[PDB]
Design a protein around this ligand. Structure first.
Ligand code: CU
Length: 169
């Protein structure tokens, strides 16, 4: 179990009371677990944000969620893991340039080639995991970053949607 501490994920901000009406997940941002093998397998379209559970996170409009402001280019991504697991890989996806923010998240709305991916070869991590990734510099405004944590032993993965206000000038 775990969540993206920085930049603050949607479930994390629910916990901090920044987002509202998030359901039970507000008390466990670390627990957005669903089937792994994304994007080939995993939670169904329109159910990515909640990973098949916690449907409240799957609601998608322009004003529904509070946005984290980020620059394109190099960014530090810090997870917090409440339980470390043998790790297949870490992946970070971003919405396409002309994606529909008033529509539930679907694989078709994502650049299915992650802008950052790290393989851990089954290794077990610490309670703090840090990644330096290059956020695409060709997008602007409201976008979603989908952070995925693939667990090696269980065919499961943890899905962390981040609502971002992107800046690329
Ligand atoms: Cu866990």
């Amino acid at each position: 179990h775990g969540y993206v501490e920085s930049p603050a994920s949607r479930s994390y901000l629910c916990k901090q009371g920044v987002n509202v009406n998030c359901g039970p997940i507000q008390y466990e941002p670390q627990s957005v677990e669903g089937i792994g093998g994304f994007p080939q397998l995993g939670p169904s379209d329109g159910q990515i944000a909640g990973a098949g559970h916690f449907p409240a996170l799957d609601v998608q409009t322009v004003d529904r969620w509070k946005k984290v402001t980020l620059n394109g280019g190099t960014n530090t991504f810090k997870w917090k893991l409440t339980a470390p697991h043998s790790t297949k890989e870490w992946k970070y996806y971003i919405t396409k340039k002309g994606w529909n923010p008033n529509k539930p998240l679907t694989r078709s709305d994502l650049d299915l080639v992650p802008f950052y991916v790290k393989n851990d070869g089954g290794a077990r991590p610490g309670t703090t995991v840090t990644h330096e990734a290059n956020v695409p510099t060709d997008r602007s405004g409201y976008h979603l970053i989908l952070a995925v944590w693939e667990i090696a032993d269980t065919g499961n993965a943890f899905y962390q949607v981040i609502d971002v206000n992107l800046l690329n000038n």
